[PDB]
């Protein structure tokens, strides 16, 4: 019916009105202090006033750090932009990691707009172009004007096209007996399709048929668009969409990431400021999540020390699982969680704590509930004592082989012999390391 | 085709209770590994869960890639199986994260259902109206069968279809509207007056009877990587084959995921999961492992099967030794299948299966001495000696490999330990680690 | 569902109605008159044109008036029957070399021969189907017609569409004519378009202009589908 | 391996024959193209498709060429 993969049983932080977290509610087990801190930062980003606030999630492996970030993402809802990222994604062959860092920094600031569109639409009735007096003069086009006759519901409009509009008319291959869509902001043209005012089954080009459009030919409609600052930056960096030569020649070239200068960013910020001062746009700060921040190296950390001091940067969440680890790119200094102390001084560390036996048992119980599986009480206790014995993740990923081995015996429940078969079939990390140590030829 | 290293395996050889037979589908032995592979095969065929990493570990020449390719063979058609080596990630065009994202997205499959209309009949009239420069091309077509008669309108791609492999008003053609395939079935008119311009020998067919237009529900399997390559830019179909797709942006993949979810909701498409196989995974940087660490936790992730013949060794990009060449984060979220070495009878049955695959007839004593050499030395040397002994066998003009051919092949071609001993007995002849060599024999 | 128009154009504050293209970029790069007059446009007090001649014509190494031996050497190398072709190659931009390329004849006594890959390409131009060379050379269109790609839908659209950044110079018309010529070059824009058929009939029959004197048109690459030809979704 | 059926030689005549019922609004409608060819110990006239004359005009084929 549905598909799940190591998540999606987490629906949110699951707090009260006063922020006090319950024991088990919303797919979460334990971690009350971390969940309350996550509720605090969720209220902080919903306050929509702060810029350049940073926390770090510290904990071991298999303790619930990325689950907290996904819970923050679902508690904020889909409207506030959330940018998941990995510390290895910053290394690009096309562009330096500094520009990738502000690439993802500007990708995490949202914006709405309320944009008016001047629309001419209808059914084309006639297509009569007129020619120039001397077309082979080298300068000037072959034609001068094109007359188009648009017919819609309760109205018929005749327009005199520019040649530049007629190029974007011709490129979508219009003809008499078609329905079009002139969009006057950019000159973009949509061929809606053949009208149903003519015959239907007499075609051979798998076309679809559209009725005559309602309303007048000339329209002014309001369209709500959600957008980021990064899309504005990359649209102004590689300008496509116009009706000039360069606009066509950019749509056919290979797209490549470029080092965006600060000057275009200041101009884009001034344009967004003049949009927000006229009461049209509203600014949506977001959340940037970097998992495995220890894989970042020293120059990215040094640039992030500048990037956090900007007046536009969003709330950034980091995560690591190293105790006493030297920074990548340096030779001798050791700092907590692989993060240098000058950036540690700007953080707000959140501890994550390990679990007990009953917490592992109820996590396995809710997991077997989510993947629609039925477990015996003795088999559940065996899974819980295995999860204390080896790891939570090894018991968490072992249950689908119990489901398969229970299915292949024409059975619905999971029994202890079935769990022992899954024990013997698949190994864990510790048994594999013991096999590697007592091995003949690097087995 | 050609007889390869794994050409003797068609499937896994499992019962309905997932009990592997001792000799079935080219597999002998390895009962527990084959049982676990059948479990993972039923898991992939179920398709409910995603993002689970499977490890196959053991010594060299044990059956890792043979088991993986047997899983691929039992997986069947319309399920993707991206089998890449570990060295392919290091590239000068794509980053390691981007290359691994493409390798992940190649193993998730989209099955789209489409509606088609099939037109077949005897053609009567074709009118083609082109401009002076040949750019604006429009036309009319008149198709007929024995009972009906229709006149259609032609488009540019249809006219370019009729222009190639030209139809001459009396051929019987086939047209798929949703595909744009023009298939000339033959010719039924049999025109007597033909000009001496073409050497056509078109077979006589009969003009089809009945309904001219018929509906057909068609299906096809596509994957996500070619979808976001197509949606990436204007000429994505060419970049699909040239491989010139450099670092597709995240909004493209986000909107493709949203469109795929919409297609699943509308019932137009359904997602068919596949398997990504990374052969010799120990040669990956720790950045690649840290990306896999998160990318295994997405819904749009396949079942990743990784094979390692390494013991405890140094992880690439770092300076500490780790089990299987992988950090403990990857071993935290992966279930490991362990393979074991073979015996006398298993090696003998492997050599019998390979000899029957290579159609080389072997005698009993030759098979015994080949098994003796494959027990003393490795299995692969005794596997590769078979064709050499066969070439020696037709060199003496008899189609049976006896003792003397395998003995001559043993003398002619050297082992690993034999080559090591022969080098170490004559170290002055070869260039050493310090680059000093004695060339003169005086 | 359309991309956001990052542009400012003439909008109405509401026997025909004429609509003129007036899309401009909201970002304006304001430039003074002094730089454009004293460094780009030549005058009596600068030496832009003299240096341009001295670098492009007088000291050009492909000049037949001064390097006739080199021109003969390259003519024997390439087998091209005009010695002034190297001068015309070296002194015009790339796209001007693209859009008026003519397949002229080259003499046999030369060294630029037919590459085996080029011969494999040239065999299968007008070859029809069920030929072995054509079928071995038409893999990509076979994959196009087998995977049903001509009826697929569009899933991705860009979020922002913007024109190029308009540079303004206050108090000069020459910059305006130069910018209008660069943005709307009639030769390139005619290469990226086509001529209407009734207009062509007025060229050829009613005016006597032959077919080979036409401006080159129709160099735009075709989109994959009819759905992929636009960014506006119904 | 492949089989090629070729016609080659010097052109002897090149006359596009008109149709017995020409269509209005057009000029020199062609029913067939007659080209004569000559070679070493061989001469033979041909009868061609009408669309071939367009390719003859594009390839600039005058009289006396091979």
């Amino acid at each position: 019916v549905t598909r799940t993969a190591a998540h999606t049983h987490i629906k949110g932080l699951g707090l009260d009105e006063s922020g006090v977290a319950k024991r088990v509610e919303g797919g979460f087990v334990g971690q009350i202090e971390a969940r309350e801190a996550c509720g605090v930062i969720v209220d902080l980003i919903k306050a929509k006033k702060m810029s350049g606030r940073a926390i770090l999630l510290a904990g071991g492996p298999s303790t619930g750090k990325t689950a907290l970030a996904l819970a923050i993402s679902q508690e904020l809802g889909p409207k506030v932009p959330f940018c998941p990222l990995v510390g290895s994604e910053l290394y690009s062959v096309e562009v330096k990691k500094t520009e990738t860092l502000m690439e993802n920094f500007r990708r995490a600031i949202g914006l709405r707009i309320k944009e008016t569109k001047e629309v001419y639409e209808g059914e084309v009735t006639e297509l009569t172009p007129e020619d120039a007096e001397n077309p082979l003069g080298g300068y000037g086009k072959t034609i001068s004007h094109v007359i188009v006759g648009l017919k819609s519901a309760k109205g018929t409009k005749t327009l005199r096209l520019d040649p530049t509009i007629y190029e974007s008319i011709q490129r979508e291959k219009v003809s008499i007996g078609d329905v079009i869509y002139i969009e006057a902001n950019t000159g973009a043209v949509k061929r809606v399709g053949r009208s149903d005012a003519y015959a239907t089954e007499f075609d051979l080009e798998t076309e679809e048929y559209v009725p005559l459009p309602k309303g007048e030919v000339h329209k002014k409609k309001e369209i709500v668009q959600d957008v980021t600052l990064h899309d504005l930056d990359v649209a102004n960096a590689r300008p496509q969409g116009g009706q000039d030569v360069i606009s066509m020649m950019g749509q056919l070239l290979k797209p490549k990431k470029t080092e965006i200068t600060e000057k275009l960013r200041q101009e884009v910020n001034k344009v967004v400021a003049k949009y927000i001062d006229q009461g049209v746009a509203e600014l949506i700060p977001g959340v940037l999540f970097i998992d495995e921040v220890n894989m970042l190296d020293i120059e990215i950390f040094t640039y992030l020390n500048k990037a956090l001091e900007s007046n536009i940067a969003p709330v950034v969440v980091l995560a690591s699982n190293r105790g006493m680890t030297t920074v990548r790119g340096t030779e001798d200094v050791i700092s907590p969680h692989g993060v240098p102390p000058d950036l540690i001084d700007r953080l707000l560390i959140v501890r994550t704590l390990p679990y007990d036996k009953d917490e592992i048992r109820t996590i396995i119980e809710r997991r077997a509930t989510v993947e629609r599986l039925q477990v015996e009480s003795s088999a559940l206790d065996l899974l819980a004592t295995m999860g204390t014995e080896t790891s939570l993740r090894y018991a968490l990923q072992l249950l689908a082989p119990c489901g398969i081995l229970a299915q292949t015996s024409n059975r619905k429940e999971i029994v202890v012999n079935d769990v022992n078969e899954a024990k013997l079939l698949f190994l864990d990390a510790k048994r594999s390391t013991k096999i590697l140590e007592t091995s003949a030829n690097y087995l | 085709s050609l007889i390869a290293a794994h050409s003797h395996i068609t499937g896994l050889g499992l019962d309905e209770n997932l009990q592997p037979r001792p000799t079935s589908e080219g597999m002998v032995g390895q009962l527990q590994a084959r049982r676990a592979a059948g479990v993972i095969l039923k898991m992939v065929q179920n398709g409910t869960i995603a993002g689970r990493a499977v490890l196959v570990a053991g010594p060299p020449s044990t059956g890792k890639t043979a088991l993986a390719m047997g899983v691929s063979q039992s997986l069947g058609k319309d399920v993707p199986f991206t089998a890449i080596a570990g060295s392919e990630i290091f590239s000068l065009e794509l980053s390691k994260t981007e290359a691994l994202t493409q390798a992940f997205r190649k193993s998730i499959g989209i099955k789209i259902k489409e509606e088609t209309e099939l037109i077949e009949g005897e053609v009567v009239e074709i009118q083609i109206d082109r401009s002076i420069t040949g750019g604006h091309k429009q036309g009319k077509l008149t198709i007929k069968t024995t009972d009906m008669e229709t006149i259609y309108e032609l488009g540019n791609k249809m006219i370019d279809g009729l222009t190639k492999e030209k139809v001459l008003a009396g051929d019987v053609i086939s047209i798929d509207k949703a595909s744009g395939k023009i298939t000339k079935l033959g010719r039924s008119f049999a025109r007597s007056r033909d000009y001496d311009a073409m050497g056509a020998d078109t077979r006589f067919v009969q003009c089809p009877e009945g309904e001219l237009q018929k509906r057909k529900t068609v299906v096809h399997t596509v994957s996500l990587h070619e979808i976001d390559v197509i949606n990436s830019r204007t000429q994505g179909f060419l970049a699909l084959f040239t491989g010139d797709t450099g670092e597709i942006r995240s909004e493209v993949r986000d909107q493709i995921n949203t469109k795929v979810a919409e297609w699943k909701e509308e019932g137009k498409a359904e997602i068919v999961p596949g398997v990504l196989f990374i052969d010799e995974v120990h040669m990956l940087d720790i950045e690649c492992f840290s990306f896999i660490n998160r990318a295994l936790e997405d819904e749009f992730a396949p079942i990743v099967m990784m094979a390692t013949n390494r013991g405890v060794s140094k992880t690439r990009g770092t300076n500490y030794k780790s089990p299987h060449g992988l950090p403990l984060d990857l071993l935290d979220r992966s279930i490991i299948i362990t393979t074991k070495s073979y015996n006398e009878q298993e090696i003998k049955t492997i050599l019998s299966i390979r000899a029957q695959e290579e159609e080389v007839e072997l005698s009993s004593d030759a098979l015994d001495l080949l098994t003796k050499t494959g027990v003393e030395t490795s299995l692969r040397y005794s596997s590769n000696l078979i064709s050499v002994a066969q070439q020696i066998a037709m060199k003496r003009k008899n189609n049976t490999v006896e003792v003397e051919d395998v003995k001559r092949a043993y003398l002619l071609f050297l082992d690993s330990a034999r080559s090591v001993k022969y080098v170490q007995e004559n170290e002055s002849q070869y260039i050493d680690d310090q680059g000093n060599v004695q060339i003169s024999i005086a | 569902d359309s991309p956001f128009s990052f542009t400012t154009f003439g909008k109405t504050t509401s026997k025909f109605t004429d609509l003129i293209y007036s899309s401009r970029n909201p970002i304006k790069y304001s430039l003074p008159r002094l730089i454009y007059e004293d460094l780009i446009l030549p005058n009596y007090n600068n030496d832009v044109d003299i240096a341009n001649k001295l670098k492009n014509v007088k000291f050009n190494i492909f000049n037949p008036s001064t390097n006739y031996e080199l021109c003969l050497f390259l003519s024997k190398l390439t087998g091209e029957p005009s010695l002034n072709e190297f001068f015309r190659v070296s002194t015009t931009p790339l796209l001007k070399r693209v859009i008026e390329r003519t397949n002229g004849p080259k003499n046999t006594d030369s060294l630029s021969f037919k590459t085996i890959t080029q011969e494999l390409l040239e065999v299968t131009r007008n070859a029809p189907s069920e030929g072995v060379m054509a079928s071995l050379l038409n893999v990509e269109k076979h994959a196009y017609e087998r995977e049903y790609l001509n009826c697929i839908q569009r899933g991705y659209h860009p979020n922002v569409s913007a024109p190029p950044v308009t540079i303004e110079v206050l108090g000069s018309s020459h910059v305006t004519n130069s910018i209008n010529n660069e943005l709307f070059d009639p030769l390139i824009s005619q290469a990226l378009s086509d001529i209407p058929a009734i207009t062509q009939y007025n060229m050829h029959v009613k005016k006597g202009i032959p077919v080979e004197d036409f401006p080159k048109t129709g160099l735009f690459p075709e989109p994959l589908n009819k759905n992929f030809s636009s960014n506006i979704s119904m | 391996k492949e089989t090629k059926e070729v016609y080659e030689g010097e052109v002897t005549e090149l006359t596009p024959e008109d149709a017995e019922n020409p269509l209005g609004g057009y000029g020199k409608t062609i029913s067939h193209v007659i080209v004569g060819l000559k070679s070493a110990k061989g001469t033979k006239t041909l009868r061609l498709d009408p669309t071939i004359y367009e390719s003859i005009q594009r390839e600039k084929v005058s009289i006396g060429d091979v």
Binding site: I176, G177, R194, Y198, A199, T200, F202 | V124, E125, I126, Q127, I128, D129, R130, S131, I132, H136, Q138, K140, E153, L168, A169, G170, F189, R191, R193 | A197, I198, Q200, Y201, N202, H204, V205 | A19, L23, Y26, G27, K28, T29, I30, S31, H32, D49, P50, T51, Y53, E54
Partner: peptide, 28 residues
């Protein structure tokens, strides 16, 4: 009642007719 056909309008364009017995090429 039957629904009328789309208008076919081809002015100043070449024409190729392929009948059963003879072919045409109406050019300019």
């Amino acid at each position: 009642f039957v629904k009328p056909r789309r208008p076919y309008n081809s002015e100043g364009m070449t024409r190729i007719l392929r009948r059963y017995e003879e072919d045409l090429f109406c050019t300019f």
